[PDB]
Amino acid sequence: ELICIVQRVNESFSLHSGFGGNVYSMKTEPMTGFTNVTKGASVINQKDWIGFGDARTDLTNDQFPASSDVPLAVAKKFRSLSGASLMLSAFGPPGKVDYLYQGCGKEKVFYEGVNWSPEAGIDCFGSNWTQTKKDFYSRIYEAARSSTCMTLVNSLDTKISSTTATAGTASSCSSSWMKSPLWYAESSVNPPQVCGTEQSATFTLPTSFGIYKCNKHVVQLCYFVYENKAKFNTFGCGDYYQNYYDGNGNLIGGMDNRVAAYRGIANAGVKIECPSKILNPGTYSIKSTPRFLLVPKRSYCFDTDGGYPIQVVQSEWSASRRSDNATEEACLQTEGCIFIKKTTPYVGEAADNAGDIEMRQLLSGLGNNDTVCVSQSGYTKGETPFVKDYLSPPKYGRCQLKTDSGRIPTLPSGLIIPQAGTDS
Amino acid sequence: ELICIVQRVNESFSLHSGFGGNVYSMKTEPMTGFTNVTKGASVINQKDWIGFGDARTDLTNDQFPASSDVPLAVAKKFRSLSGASLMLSAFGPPGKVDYLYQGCGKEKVFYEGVNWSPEAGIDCFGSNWTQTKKDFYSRIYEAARSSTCMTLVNSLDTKISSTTATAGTASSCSSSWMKSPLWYAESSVNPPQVCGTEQSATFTLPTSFGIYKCNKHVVQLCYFVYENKAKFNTFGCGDYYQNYYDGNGNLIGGMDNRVAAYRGIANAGVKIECPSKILNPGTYSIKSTPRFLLVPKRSYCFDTDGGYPIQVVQSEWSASRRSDNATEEACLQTEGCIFIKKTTPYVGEAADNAGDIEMRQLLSGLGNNDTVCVSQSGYTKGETPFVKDYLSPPKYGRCQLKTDSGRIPTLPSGLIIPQAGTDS
Amino acid sequence: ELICIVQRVNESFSLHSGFGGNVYSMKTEPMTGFTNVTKGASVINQKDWIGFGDARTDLTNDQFPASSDVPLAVAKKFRSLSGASLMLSAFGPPGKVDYLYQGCGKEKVFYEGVNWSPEAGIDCFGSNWTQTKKDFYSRIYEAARSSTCMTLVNSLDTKISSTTATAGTASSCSSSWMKSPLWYAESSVNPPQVCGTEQSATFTLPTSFGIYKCNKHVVQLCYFVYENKAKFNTFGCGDYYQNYYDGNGNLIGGMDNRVAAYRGIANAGVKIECPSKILNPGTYSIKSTPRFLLVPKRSYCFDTDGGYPIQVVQSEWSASRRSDNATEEACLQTEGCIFIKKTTPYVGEAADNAGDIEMRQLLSGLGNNDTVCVSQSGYTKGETPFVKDYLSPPKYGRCQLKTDSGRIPTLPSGLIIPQAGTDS
Amino acid sequence: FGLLFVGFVAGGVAGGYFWGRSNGGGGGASVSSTQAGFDKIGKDIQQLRNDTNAAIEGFNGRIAHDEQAIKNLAKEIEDARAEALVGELGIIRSLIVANISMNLKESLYELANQITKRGGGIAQEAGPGCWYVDSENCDASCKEYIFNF
Amino acid sequence: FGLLFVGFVAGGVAGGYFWGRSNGGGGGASVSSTQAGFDKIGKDIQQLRNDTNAAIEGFNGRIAHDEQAIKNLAKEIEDARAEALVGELGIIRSLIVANISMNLKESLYELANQITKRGGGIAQEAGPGCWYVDSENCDASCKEYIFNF
Amino acid sequence: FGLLFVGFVAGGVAGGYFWGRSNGGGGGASVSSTQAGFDKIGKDIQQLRNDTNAAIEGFNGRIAHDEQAIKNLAKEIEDARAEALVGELGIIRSLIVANISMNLKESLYELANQITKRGGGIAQEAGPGCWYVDSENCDASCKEYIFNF
Ligand SMILES: CC(=O)N[C@H]1[C@H](OCCN=[N+]=[N-])O[C@H](CO)[C@@H](O)[C@@H]1O[C@@H]1O[C@H](CO)[C@H](O)[C@H](O[C@]2(C(=O)O)C[C@H](O)[C@@H](NC(C)=O)[C@H]([C@H](O)[C@H](O)COC(C)=O)O2)[C@H]1O
Ligand SMILES: CC(=O)N[C@H]1[C@H](OCCN=[N+]=[N-])O[C@H](CO)[C@@H](O)[C@@H]1O[C@@H]1O[C@H](CO)[C@H](O)[C@H](O[C@]2(C(=O)O)C[C@H](O)[C@@H](NC(C)=O)[C@H]([C@H](O)[C@H](O)COC(C)=O)O2)[C@H]1O
Ligand SMILES: CC(=O)N[C@H]1[C@H](OCCN=[N+]=[N-])O[C@H](CO)[C@@H](O)[C@@H]1O[C@@H]1O[C@H](CO)[C@H](O)[C@H](O[C@]2(C(=O)O)C[C@H](O)[C@@H](NC(C)=O)[C@H]([C@H](O)[C@H](O)COC(C)=O)O2)[C@H]1O
Ligand SMILES: *[C@@H]1O[C@H](CO)[C@@H](O[C@@H]2O[C@H](CO)[C@@H](O)[C@H](O)[C@H]2NC(C)=O)[C@H](O)[C@H]1NC(C)=O
Ligand SMILES: *[C@@H]1O[C@H](CO)[C@@H](O[C@@H]2O[C@H](CO)[C@@H](O)[C@H](O)[C@H]2NC(C)=O)[C@H](O)[C@H]1NC(C)=O
Ligand SMILES: *[C@@H]1O[C@H](CO)[C@@H](O[C@@H]2O[C@H](CO)[C@@H](O)[C@H](O)[C@H]2NC(C)=O)[C@H](O)[C@H]1NC(C)=O
Ligand SMILES: *[C@@H]1O[C@H](CO)[C@@H](O[C@@H]2O[C@H](CO)[C@@H](O)[C@H](O)[C@H]2NC(C)=O)[C@H](O)[C@H]1NC(C)=O
Ligand SMILES: *[C@@H]1O[C@H](CO)[C@@H](O[C@@H]2O[C@H](CO)[C@@H](O)[C@H](O)[C@H]2NC(C)=O)[C@H](O)[C@H]1NC(C)=O
Ligand SMILES: *[C@@H]1O[C@H](CO)[C@@H](O)[C@H](O)[C@H]1NC(C)=O
């Protein structure tokens, strides 16, 4: 008698091919899968990142931790002071808090800005501070993108030529003036007969500041905006001008009406505009209309040793106050910037404006020891190489790829029977 | 008795190694091969491309389809009008057809230009229109490279300061003038005694035009070229100048003889030069010699949402007319531009200059539903990952790689015998 | 009786897994390993490289081969002359050797520079020749990075407007002057009463020079540096200026004190500064103070057909002479530049300053027929795809990757037993 | 027909591993049972399936570092990278399937070998998974000893 | 020497699959035939060769997306990419060759198994592709029944 | 237990290939020797190990062209490239290990086959590497002829 083990399959079995042997099975299981994506901020390296912020990340606030959007351990990684903002420290308006932001970190989190919003009501002849705000943070984010560190430079070496010029003040600016730019004026120019002499100045952007190397500086090269040569001649003789030159003499900024058309709004009166520019370290010249001279007195110092795309966190008030979205728009138009945004209003635990449940959820990733990828879609762990939907850029780290679930191969499971040769 | 199947090989058999078993065979067959390359134009995505052209792609021409270098279905994808060209619409010379080119497509085909060649005989004080043509299309191709869409902007908002200045005309320009630039002149300046005042103007490049977003504008900042300050003083007092400034006052174009040497050709008389530049949206200033002011009045609007390398098709007349190769040279010196060129003369079916057998062969790929790669060498289907010779850049899509035929591995075929173990 | 081969393993055996069969073994051997890295200069392609040098690579030197840091076959690949340097040929100072450096090679070795160090004691009103040296070689290396070839252009077409101006000389410059720039002066300007007229000039950067295509030119746009407008008025009326404009009129260099502050050192007297710039071919204008005009008369011509990262070799004297490290610093701050540096002093075999044992070791790679990768860490052969430590950039060729030795998989060796199935 | 072959069956009828017997009276007429105590096979399948985790973990742990500053998705590039990774996963799959196949087939051979030595040498192998037994000095309790059904 | 071995022959002499027989008189002297009716092997080879198309199509369908704006060929980069793809094709080749080898060898085992059950159990296996037959109750028509030459 | 199985031993005791014998008196008690003249196995292992050089040389000869002008190491990118190459080397390793395994196992089968035809058909195969011998007309010089220990 011939006795045999017999191998047989059903219509329920499908054949899976192999390099060196096939397999019949009824069930299959996918070989791998998608990695969850979590919205909000995080870091891939806990020992090389830095945060810059305000009360909402300030562990020294009287109401900590209720006033905080991050736990203690994350707050220790921030450089923050209640009431502060990068922009407030750039200009230093009268009576505002003036924090010296500085630090180093390849990954960077910017979570401030709200402390100079329209709610602040800072005037000082500002044409449109929201516009200035957007321009300013754009330059910061651009420079931060390629820098390892950042520091406020709280005082530039400056020198003016006039010996009669005195420090300028205005009732629109709390009856004084910004820390930067400085405002120098000669009391005598008077378009009667007295017309004074063209004013001159230099300012130096240092090659370093403390322990921080400077390869690049963000500065504002402000100019006044008058209604028209005539309204201007209410104050100065001839045409208004305030020109900025590098050491060789190339014009780099300012407003020279003598070639450029006037662009002021009717009967608004005098306005000041402060575009920000990225300049190399060095000494720079200024030439201006005799009566009024503006001189940059601060900067932010960056290096070019490199960094990762940055994270910028929405910085807005609760509903009752007047906010802006200038840092959002700064971030959107600047390459290498990732923006973190709430979907619900800011409702603080401490008071109205500090300690928000959603923001705490969004910032909790800052947070983790196992984040491998950070993107404009959120952050991921190192589970699999795939995600269900694209991780939107900017992004960095070990970042997953989108593939259709159907393109993920399967493996036989359940009852299994081998097959090889042609069996015929 | 021992009875065995015996396996044996000849000197004609060669051994092919495997990971888990070798194979003896007499014949081999290459595992894969090269994909044919077809010369001419094509697209990898039929629902995201656009053509810009003239009579040769105009389905409304009286002699269609005999006057066409493409079939109906492809012509429907072109924006073309008989007698038109991008350059003709840029300047709008007297009596020429003035088509408003506009459309969107990640892949772009430029097949026009011939309608303003030396054959056209347009004068209008042109120094060298062929030179202007080359400069103009260079800017177009450069801007088109990174844009999804393009549109003529057929009228810029402009404003001149003079109240006495009137519209300028010349017998060299059909006793009138271009649509762009505008020519403004004061009848009184007369180097007797009458010398007038410096002329001023602004022109605005919009942030949008219809449904089209503008991030960049191609415009011409023209200036006149006089023989020498003296020949110039035939017309104006002092030195000629026509300067272009942005909103802040930075010089961006024009000709200021006051610092720059004169560069006119002897007794040729006055010439006009019109270099094209790529400018951001905004408002721009002009300052000029009192008698003659030139003001840009048109542009081409592009976005920066991205696009593929473009295809530019040779646009020349049949032998009897006077052509140029300015769009060829524009394309060659501009990154991301692929040029399509005939090897035989243009011989039209409709008349001399429309409906060419070779061009129809070259444009037939526009055409296909199965093109996966487009390159300066021609286009390919998705047959294999290899080509016999390099696909020259610019190129995009699933593009084949060059490898020597000898580096393509083979597989055993014909009579085959397995081998494993050392057999000794 | 049942008789069987029996397979058995010890605690000394470990199981190695395979796709289709496992293996027990006692020993393992790493599958592959690291490729040695050799410090110094080399090339990956012996038929496409060029060297530029001095006595130390000059096979025509009287003391060859004792005065050489390379053997004959490598010296034949250099363009060198005893006593020469790129910088000496740029300016052509009185009585110095003036070699016309020219050649083509995708890989480039710059091994000269020492012949104009502080030891040379060239004065000629130089503010800081070491500074000039660093600026000059930076421009060279930058341009060389993207060029296939380089040539001195030993004479630019130039034309000055003045008919009274004469060639300038000074006792600080061997009672004559540089070949470049040219110095033109009118004897009459005298701030008594005589004040002369603004001087003018043009210089042309050619589109080619001999067989060499020029896409880019390295030139110096020099200007004088006076102590202060007053010390200046020792010589000229009004403010000093020397301005450089392109053909359209855009300022591109020079020193215009009229807007820029003075920057001279007290009682040093007049100094000349010569920053180098990279300019396109074309014709350029100069406007200057009546008494003194400087005009560029030489350049280095480069193309943009592409090249590899360059190698720059430390060019310093033996200990007894005064050296500088300007070419080192030029190379460090310039992308695509690889610097080769000795660790011991230069001790020549011929005399003190030519024929050094260490440099010969470092340059011997120039040298080899089997170098596949060149990097800032040294060069490698094509042994394996790995190195023990990173190859620092800049680098090019088939370059190895760093991996930990522990991540290199092993293969079973020694006594071996196969395993398959579950054996239970 | 004995471990070198897999047969198909229609409608209902269980798939899997069964005992099959042949001739007897001359000529016989076949017979195929309804399962044995092939407990080894079940456990072996379990072990072999769990052993695939090693190859999958290797793949899952490999994620390329990237850095993009760009603001708009480079979709074609993203898709190509995914397609390449899916291709690699496809090779690994084909390797794993053959690895299971070959190691199961070997586990089946080791089962059959135990049966051979269990009635040895009454069994007499007729290729893997098949035996010739002399019905004259192996009755029925003998056969049930050797094959256990 | 029976399906575990491949032998070589010189000059003319056909390569392939043949019937070989041994002893007889004590001591015998060998003999190797001139082909059988190994029709199965021919058809199997055909099927196995056609089955390689699946692995080749997988490879041919994979072409990386690219975009180059540059005007001059980046030759070294192009060559490296090709070299990498050729390397991958080389692995796939080695996989395919072994896959053919192993599945042919198995088809050969299935041929030999049918011969064993054809004269069973007169045949008696001596390793794969070899048998011991008792020339006393298998004459010649018996042997020609079982082996068909 | 005969070429389909690998057994473990404790403390000292040599690992490797040995001769093992079984019953005798009813019931017997086993025995495992202390090496044979398995000279074939030693040489085969040598050949198989040397044959791996082909696959390693293929891998070693493949080095991607690169060009970097940057002055600071892009460490994360460098590490990712290495990690990818190490992954590929890992697949090749797994292929090589199985290739050795399968070709050694086959060389072992070819050894056992020579032993079968050496005492044929006194030997009688009981799965690979095992035989049933009738102690009645194979004495001891017979067994030592066939198995050589
Ligand atoms: C009060 C005065 O002198 N002039 C009126 C002036 O018109 C008067 C007509 N005389 N004439 N001819 O017209 C302007 C607009 O019509 C008025 O602003 C001006 O009155 C201003 O009153 C405001 C309060 O609303 C201020 O007091 C301003 O005076 C200051 C100030 O802004 O505080 C006094 C500051 O000390 C002075 N400081 C400096 C450094 O200049 C400041 C400043 O000059 C002006 O604002 C100039 O503004 C700029 C930046 O151009 O004015 C009175 O001008
Ligand atoms: C006719 C005239 O007024 N002047 C002669 C002028 O020399 C005469 C000497 N008098 N003095 N002293 O010299 C120039 C060159 O020697 C001649 O071109 C000019 O004669 C021109 O005749 C041509 C025909 O060949 C034209 O008629 C031109 O007149 C126009 C024109 O070009 O059509 C008339 C236009 O209306 C006028 N339009 C405007 C808006 O200015 C146009 C134009 O001024 C001039 O071309 C200026 O050209 C530019 C752009 O600078 O001239 C007569 O000039
Ligand atoms: C000698 C002379 O004319 N002037 C003194 C001049 O002060 C005299 C006061 N008179 N007043 N009024 O002051 C300067 C500094 O106090 C002295 O340099 C100058 O004396 C110089 O003597 C030096 C030697 O140390 C030179 O001879 C120099 O004369 C030359 C020169 O440098 O060789 C003569 C050259 O021919 C002349 N060449 C040209 C083309 O200009 C050269 C040159 O002008 C000056 O150096 C100008 O330098 C520049 C580039 O601005 O001077 C005497 O000046
Ligand atoms: C798998 O291992 C086998 C056996 O070691 C290799 O077969 C050898 O292949 C070379 C050709 O490269 C022949 O010259 C040798 O004679 C073969 N040896 C034997 C014993 O047949 C085979 O190359 C390996 N597979 C791969 C793909 O590397
Ligand atoms: C192929 O499958 C076999 C069997 O499942 C795997 O062998 C196992 O390997 C691990 C080591 O990784 C051992 O600890 C297990 O005991 C082995 N199981 C058996 C039954 O031997 C093998 O890893 C797989 N091959 C690869 C390369 O993954
Ligand atoms: C083909 O065979 C398989 C198993 O031989 C059958 O699978 C069983 O089906 C029932 C209900 O579907 C389950 O409860 C059992 O668990 C399955 N068996 C196993 C191995 O677990 C299958 O139903 C058969 N198909 C047909 C068409 O009859
Ligand atoms: C080695 O063997 C093969 C086949 O055993 C021989 O191949 C045959 O050769 C003739 C003419 O070359 C062909 O018409 C046949 O079709 C081939 N056989 C097959 C399998 O189709 C080969 O000629 C032999 N070589 C030597 C050296 O004798
Ligand atoms: C396990 O077995 C192996 C070999 O069967 C033993 O290896 C031998 O050990 C001695 C000394 O260590 C060497 O001189 C021999 O060369 C080794 N054998 C071989 C194959 O060359 C090993 O010692 C045993 N281990 C234990 C724990 O006893
Ligand atoms: C062993 O490997 C090398 C290749 O590294 C080969 O050249 C040599 O001939 C091989 N030896 C044998 C006996 O095959």
CB F124 within 8 A of CB E125: no
Q: How far, in Å, CA of C381 to CA of C399, rounded?
A: 9
Q: In terms of Cα–Cα distance, which of B31, B27, B30 is closest to B13?
A: B27
Tokens of B89: 């619409």
DSSP state of C262: P
The residue type at D121: G
The residue type at C118: P
List ligand 7's pocket residues with C-beta within 6 A. Answer: B 10-12, 415; E 12, 14-16
Supply the DSSP string of C133-151, one letter for each residue. HHHHHHHHHHHHHT-SEEE
**Phi/psi zone of residue B301: left (φ > 0), alpha (ψ -120 to 50 degrees), beta?**
beta
Q: How far, in Å, CA of C381 to CA of A249, rounded?
A: 51
Query: What dihedral do alpha carbons E122, E124, E129, E133 form, nearest 10°?
Result: -60
Tokens of B235: 């017309």
Q: Tell me the CA–centroid distance for residue E14 and ligand 7, in Å.
A: 6
Q: Which helix (H) or strand (E) holds C363?
A: helix C357-363
**Pocket of ligand 8 contains residue C423 by CB under 6 Å:** no
Q: What is the bridge-based pairing of β-strands A208-209 and A212-213?
A: antiparallel
Beta pairing partners, B310 = B337
* Closest ligand to the CA of A175: 1
Tokens of B420: 């494993």
Q: Which of C398, C411, C416 sits opposite F104 (nearest CB)?
A: C416
Residue A1 touches chain E, beta carbons under 8 Å: no
CB F2 within 8 A of CB F128: yes
Q: How far, in Å, CA of C208 to CA of E88, rounded?
A: 46
Give the CATH fold of the F1-149 domain: Hemagglutinin Ectodomain; Chain B (3.90.20)
DSSP state of A105: -
Residues of B with Cβ-Cβ distance to C249 under 8 angstroms: 251, 254-256, 258-260
Q: Cα separations (Å) of A207 from A302, A316, B162, D35? A: 10, 35, 49, 85
Query: What dihedral do alpha carbons C225, C229, C230, C231 form, nearest 10°?
Result: 0
Q: In terms of Cα–Cα distance, which of E75, E72, E67 is closest to B397?
A: E67
Resolution attained, angstroms? 2.2
Q: Which of E14, E90, E104 sits opposite B416 (nearest CB)?
A: E104
Q: How far, in Å, CA of C284 to CA of B353, rounded?
A: 43
What would the CATH number be for the domain defined by A13-33+404-419?
Answer: 2.20.70.20
Provide the total of helices (H) and of strands (E) in chain F, helices listed first: 4, 5
| Secondary structure (3-state) at C68 | coil
Closest ligand 2 atom to B168 CA: 40
Contacts for B62-67 with beta carbons within 8 Å, 24 or more apart?
Answer: B63/B350, B63/B351, B63/B354, B63/B355, B65/B355, B66/B349, B66/B350, B66/B354, B66/B355, B67/B348, B67/B349, B67/B350, B67/B351, B67/B354, B67/B355
Closest ligand 1 atom to A224 CA: 50
The technique by which this structure was obtained is X-ray
DSSP state of B48: S
CB B4 within 8 A of CB E4: no
Non-local (6+) Cβ contacts of B416 within 8 A are: B23, B24, B25, E45, E48, E49, E100, E104
Å between C19 CA and nearest CA of chain D: 5
Q: How far, in Å, CA of C137 to CA of C296, rounded?
A: 17
Residues of F with Cβ-Cβ distance to A18 under 8 angstroms: none
Å between B142 CA and nearest CA of chain F: 26
Beta pairing partners, B410 = B30
Query: What dihedral do alpha carbons B155, B157, B161, B163 form, nearest 10°?
Result: 60
Distance of CA C271 to the CA centre of its chain: 26
Q: How far, in Å, CA of B184 to CA of B196, rounded?
A: 14
Q: What burial class does residue B373 get, using C-beta atoms within 10 Å of its C-beta: 0-12 exposed, 13-18 middle, 19+ buried? A: buried
Å between B82 CA and nearest CA of chain A: 41
Q: In terms of Cα–Cα distance, which of D94, C189, F67, A173 is closest to E96?
A: D94
Residues of B with Cβ-Cβ distance to C204 under 8 angstroms: none
| Gap between the terminal Cα atoms of chain C | 24
Chain A neighbors (3+ CB pairs < 8 Å): B, C, D, E, F
CATH 2.20.70.20 boundaries in chain C:
13-33+404-419
Non-local (6+) Cβ contacts of C27 within 8 A are: C412, C413, C414
Å between D85 CA and nearest CA of chain A: 9
Q: What is the bridge-based pairing of β-strands C216-220 and C212-213?
A: unpaired
Asked, as a colleague might, if the bond just before A181 is cis with ω within 30 of 0, I would say yes
**Contact (CB<8Å) A382/D17:** no
| Secondary structure (3-state) at A312 | strand
Q: What burial class does residue B47 get, using C-beta atoms within 10 Å of its C-beta: 0-12 exposed, 13-18 middle, 19+ buried? A: exposed
Q: How far, in Å, CA of D126 to CA of B353, rounded?
A: 85
Non-local (6+) Cβ contacts of B47 within 8 A are: none
Q: How far, in Å, CA of F149 to CA of F134, rounded?
A: 16
Q: In terms of Cα–Cα distance, which of C278, B211, B147, D70 is closest to A145?
A: D70
| Closest CA to ligand 4's atom 9 | B17
Locus of tokens 């009185």:
C94
Q: In terms of Cα–Cα distance, which of B6, E148, E128, F109 is closest to D126?
A: E128
CB A284 within 8 A of CB A244: yes
The residue type at B333: Q
Supply the DSSP string of chain E, one letter for each residue. --SS-EEE--SS---EEEEEE--SSSS---EE-S----HHHHHHHHHHHHTTHHHHHHHHT---EEEE--SS--HHHHHHHHHHHHHHHHHHHHHHHHHHHHHHHHHHHHHHHHHHHHTTTTS-BSSTTEEE--TTT--SHHHHHHT--
| Gap between the terminal Cα atoms of chain B | 24
